[PDB]
Design a protein around this ligand. Structure first.
Ligand SMILES: [Mg+2]
Length: 150
């Protein structure tokens, strides 16, 4: 499925990591704030504010890419509530005239870092709690932290 032949959409039965990702972009009194995060069901393992103006879609790609990078050499089940990020990870060919070009390139390269990988798209279950955790962490970073650029 996609550029990476063994990529599955169903959870691996023996993953080393089960992570949740989210990218956020909120309009706070006319100012565009953004953030991204990677979490386990209950703990934040990476989160940061992104440059002013960063769109939600761009932030979503950045978060998923970070998860892939941190899981290099391991078996990863990673969740995303972004249809856009999920679909992008399955692209096999695209032109230069596309939005978020740099982020897409980084994602496509990162797909090959994990030993085994499942990217899953989407309550009171563990997966619902994890997705909610990533959402809260990305929004918290966007609203309460300062970005490294801009
Ligand atoms: Mg999302």
């Amino acid at each position: 499925h996609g550029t990476r032949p063994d990529l599955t959409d169903q959870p691996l039965p023996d993953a080393d990591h089960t992570w949740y990702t989210d990218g956020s972009s909120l309009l706070q009194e006319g100012q565009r704030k953004a953030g991204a995060a990677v979490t386990t069901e209950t703990e934040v393992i990476w989160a940061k504010a992104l440059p002013a103006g960063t769109s939600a879609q761009r932030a979503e790609l950045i978060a998923l890419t970070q998860a892939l990078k941190m899981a290099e050499g391991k078996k990863l089940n990673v969740y995303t509530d972004s249809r856009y990020a999920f679909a992008t990870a399955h692209l096999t060919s695209e032109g230069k005239e596309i939005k978020n070009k740099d982020e897409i390139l980084a994602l496509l390269k990162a797909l090959f870092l994990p030993k085994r990988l499942s990217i899953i798209h989407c309550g009171h279950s563990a997966e619902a709690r994890g997705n909610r955790m990533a959402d809260q962490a990305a929004r918290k970073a966007a609203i309460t932290e300062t970005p490294d650029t801009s």
